[PDB]
């Protein structure tokens, strides 16, 4: 997010992530899922159950909107244009589930790469995902 | 925050392998670094200009050990939350002032702290349990408020 | 969300003005305009696609007075806030999984009404009493979440 | 806030309270400390008492500065950058508590002016002041 430092921070955790991003993205659901039952209501078309194909699926699809946007840190809304659209006008997402998913991200991180994420990674990853659920919850109009 | 059997016992194997000193001190300065106005509450305790100066706090440090072992009296006491956290509320509304969403900040960071330690054993149904955990002791910190 | 005894009678005299129909309505069409992911609950109530469009909403207008209902049914229990609300509870939260924030966000709405209809009478202290009442409301409808 | 709409709609609403600004705003901060006890402890050296010269000239501030940020929606970080630092930096204002300040500024609103505080007003208003807020908070770094 938008200081230099912390835009140097999440590039730096995101490459550590890398070509692990698909599966701790599914993951991360799996935990919103899990521990934030309110949150399966958005995915009735999914079968949610461990190693599902779609909760798979998506995963991958997640983690590539979060690789577009480490990489587009100076023009999310742009960058993020068309999911704002869906997040907010079609779906309706309440934006306290931004929160979860995004603390389940979190989770997620600490629980792989315990090393590698610092109090100074947490606040930077933190702030990026607040940037990002804002963006995509903009529309809010 | 009504626990499963399974969960019950999910909760207390991983808290006997806390170590509440080292995962106190992680919680509390990472509570402060991550959100920084509840350095607020804690400005008695000297230096918390900087991250590392919050992450050097020895005070910080040291109640961060009494906030985790405060968790874990509500984690060996499920059922009667509110009577274990009732002078805590009464001190943390009417003599701190700490707004409660502050505590549901806290619990998510301690979440966070759980899983940097255990790794892989800090499944998702592991972590639900956790999060019951510590959406209760939220609850009843806030009861004296309500 | 206990109330002084003066606070207990601002309460009641203001109710017994309360135009359940005209402020129901109102009350839950604001909530769909100026939160509008609040609209997803209920698309089966026809068009919400603009503000023009859940203003004029018959459904809408008609739920939002059984809500207001509800709410004097709370505000004549103060002491079982829990009771009144317990089957409630449930419905929001294992039928229709409405985030708990959401009560919060209705009983701000509900203020804003009241003071719009009440004008100088909704004073300070008139409000400062209704903001207990609506927590305590939303806290009630949260508990089967809790 | 952004939307030109919006924009319009708040330029509407704040001209009628025009000259009422000072007054209105006093009364907020009043309606907040009444009813949000935990916000007056960021004011210990205030008489928060009704009548209060403290609270009177406290208003009138406030209530500048949201005038100059209704005539500067294109460059509110800009416009509001040393009150930014204030908030954020030096009092560590909790976010929660300009959410408490907005609804107490729009119940002072509704009660006052009651015909010209409409549903679509009123949506305007609450997406002014939460653009306020954030960039108030914006250094939450
Ligand atoms: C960091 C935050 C988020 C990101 C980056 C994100 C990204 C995405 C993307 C890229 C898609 C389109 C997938 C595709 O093209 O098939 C999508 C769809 C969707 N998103 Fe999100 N999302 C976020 C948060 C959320 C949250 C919090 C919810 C609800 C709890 C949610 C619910 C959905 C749903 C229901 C779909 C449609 C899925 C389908 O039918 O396949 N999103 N999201
Ligand atoms: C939600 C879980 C929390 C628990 C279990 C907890 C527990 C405790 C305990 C056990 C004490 C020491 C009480 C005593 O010795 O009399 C304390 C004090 C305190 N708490 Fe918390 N606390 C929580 C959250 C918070 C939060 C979120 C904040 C502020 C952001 C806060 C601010 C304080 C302050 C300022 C003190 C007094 C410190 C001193 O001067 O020594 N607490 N808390
Ligand atoms: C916090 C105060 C609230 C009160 C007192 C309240 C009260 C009620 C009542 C009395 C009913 C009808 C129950 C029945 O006839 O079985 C109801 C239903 C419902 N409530 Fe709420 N409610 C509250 C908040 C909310 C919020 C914030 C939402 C969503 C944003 C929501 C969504 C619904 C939905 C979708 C229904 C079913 C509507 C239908 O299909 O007819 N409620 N509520
Ligand atoms: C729309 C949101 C807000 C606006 C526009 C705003 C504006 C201002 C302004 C203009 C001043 C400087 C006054 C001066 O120069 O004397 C100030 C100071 C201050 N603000 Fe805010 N404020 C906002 C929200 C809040 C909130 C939510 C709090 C805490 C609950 C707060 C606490 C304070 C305090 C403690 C001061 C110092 C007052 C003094 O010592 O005279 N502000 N604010």
Chains 1, 4 share one sequence.
Not at chain 1, 53 to 79: F, I, M, N, W
Not at chain 2, 7 to 29: D, M, P, Y
Not at chain 2, 39 to 45: A, G, I, L, P, V
Request: overall charge neutral.
């Amino acid at each position: 997010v938008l200081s230099d430092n912390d835009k140097t921070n999440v590039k730096a955790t995101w490459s550590k992530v890398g070509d692990h991003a698909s599966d701790y993205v599914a993951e991360a659901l799996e935990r919103m899922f899990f521990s934030f039952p309110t949150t399966k209501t958005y995915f009735p078309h999914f079968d949610l159950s461990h190693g599902s194909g779609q909760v798979k699926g998506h995963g991958k699809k997640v983690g590539e909107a979060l690789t577009q946007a480490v990489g587009h840190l100076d023009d999310l809304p742009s960058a993020l244009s068309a999911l704002s659209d869906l997040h907010a006008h079609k779906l309706r997402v309440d934006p306290v589930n931004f929160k979860l998913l995004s603390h389940c991200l979190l989770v997620t991180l600490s629980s792989h790469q315990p090393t590698e994420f610092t109090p100074e990674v947490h606040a930077s990853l933190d702030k990026f995902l607040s940037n990002v659920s804002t963006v995509l919850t903009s529309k809010y109009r | 925050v009504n626990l499963t059997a399974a969960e019950k016992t999910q909760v207390a194997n991983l808290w006997g392998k806390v170590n509440v000193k080292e995962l106190g001190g992680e919680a509390l300065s990472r509570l402060l670094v991550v959100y920084p106005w509840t350095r607020r509450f804690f400005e008695h305790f000297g230096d918390l200009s900087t991250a590392d100066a919050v992450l050097h706090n020895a005070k910080v440090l040291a109640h961060g050990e009494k906030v985790l072992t405060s968790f874990g009296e509500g984690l060996k006491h499920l059922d009667n939350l509110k009577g274990t956290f009732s002078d805590l509320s009464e001190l943390h509304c009417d003599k701190l002032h700490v707004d409660p969403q502050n505590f549901r900040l806290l619990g998510n960071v301690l979440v966070i702290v759980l899983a940097r330690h255990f790794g892989k054993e800090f499944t998702p149904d592991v972590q639900a349990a956790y999060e019951k955990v510590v959406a209760g002791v939220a609850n009843a910190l806030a009861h004296k408020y309500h």
